[PDB]
Amino acid sequence: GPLGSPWGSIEREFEELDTQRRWQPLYLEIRNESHDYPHRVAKFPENRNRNRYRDVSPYDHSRVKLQNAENDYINASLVDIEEAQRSYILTQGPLPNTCCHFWLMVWQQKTKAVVMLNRIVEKESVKCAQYWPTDDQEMLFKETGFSVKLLSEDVKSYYTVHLLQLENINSGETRTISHFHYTTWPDFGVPESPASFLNFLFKVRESGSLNPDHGPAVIHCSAGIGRSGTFSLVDTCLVLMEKGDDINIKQVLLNMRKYRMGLIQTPDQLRFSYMAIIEGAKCIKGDSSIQKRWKELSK
Numbered sequence: 028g029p030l031g032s033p034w035g036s037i038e039r040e041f042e043e044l045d046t047q048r049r050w051q052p053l054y055l056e057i058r059n060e061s062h063d064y065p066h067r068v069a070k071f072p073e074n075r076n077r078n079r080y081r082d083v084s085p086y087d088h089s090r091v092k093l094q095n096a097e098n099d100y101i102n103a104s105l106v107d108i109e110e111a112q113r114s115y116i117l118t119q120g121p122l123p124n125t126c127c128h129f130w131l132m133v134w135q136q137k138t139k140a141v142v143m144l145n146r147i148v149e150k151e152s153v154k155c156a157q158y159w160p161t162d163d164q165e166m167l168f169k170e171t172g173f174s175v176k177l178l179s180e181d182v183k184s185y186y187t188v189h190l191l192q193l194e195n196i197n198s199g200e201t202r203t204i205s206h207f208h209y210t211t212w213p214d215f216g217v218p219e220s221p222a223s224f225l226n227f228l229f230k231v232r233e234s235g236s237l238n239p240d241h242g243p244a245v246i247h248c249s250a251g252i253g254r255s256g257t258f259s260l261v262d263t264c265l266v267l268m269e270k271g272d273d274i275n276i277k278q279v280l281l282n283m284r285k286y287r288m289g290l291i292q293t294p295d296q297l298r299f300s301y302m303a304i305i306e307g308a309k310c311i312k313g314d315s316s317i318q319k320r321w322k323e324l325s326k
């Protein structure tokens with residue numbers, strides 16, 4: 028094949044964008060080439076109190092449906108990329124009256140992990156409801172028949188992991204859910220460092236929660252598009268390079284935007300994605316002797 032390293036094509040494109048200061052023009056191309064798709068159900072009058080933001084809706088062809096309910100609607104989208112054997116659900120931070128629907132979805136889809144990338148309060152405004160308990164009291168969701176209990180808490184400098192017990196009162200079953208909370212990523216902002224973000228993604232992966240033997244993981248922030256889209260694009264692109272595909276980041280992002288509108292919301296969020304994909308690629312382990320030498324010489 029080509030003479031470069033596994034990440035060489037992406038790294039040279041990054042340097043060229045920096046030197047010519049072309050991050051804003053590229054972000055504008057992506058916005059202009061993103062097609063729109065029908066989102067009629069989201070706009071029904073009966074669903075107005077189920078949406079956090081009037082300008083952020085799931086498309087009809089990929090929305091997640093609630094089963095055995097009179098109104099099947101939730102502001103959530105299935106993003107499935109079968110070239111990488113990866114499936115995700117991207118969703119808004121639930122409102123006080125949609126927390127019950129959020130846990131019904133987690134149960135019906137056989138999810139093992141929830142990845143949360145926002146704080147409850149940001150710049151003096153509420154961004155998400157308190158949908159899990161912080162002490163030893165059980166938290167009851169009576170509309171859909173679930174209860175939630177805190178089992179364990181592990182607090183680090185820039186993220187926290189909660190283990191939660193989710194009880195289906197109607198079926199007499201419980202499951203253990205892993206709750207991965209990144210606590211230092213600002214709204215319309217970027218994480219502290221590539222190294223910080225990547226340590227977090229490796230913890231999510233090590234738990235097995237993204238593997239094809241579980242249901243899709245639930246990823247959310249406040250609207251479910253800016254920070255959630257950054258996390259999913261970086262993870263998907265790293266899987267594709269691991270399997271050997273020669274990838275074009277603009278092309279992969281446009282394809283993922285066919286499943287949910289607006290993923291990645293600023294030019295600096297796009298630039299951070301390139302940096303995390305390059306630095307992460309240098310961490311992957313494998314059997315190739317050639318690949319291992321590239322890693323040692325680039326550290």
Ligand SMILES: CC(C)CCN1CC(c2cc(O)c(N3CC(=O)NS3(=O)=O)c(F)c2)C1
Pocket residue numbers: 080081082083145213214215216248249250251252253254255292
């Ligand atoms: C022009 C206005 C009248 C439109 C009304 N809106 C849409 C809003 C919105 C969009 C977002 O993309 C985000 N996020 C930023 C990110 O970095 N992650 S996010 O949680 O998705 C957000 F917090 C809020 C506000």
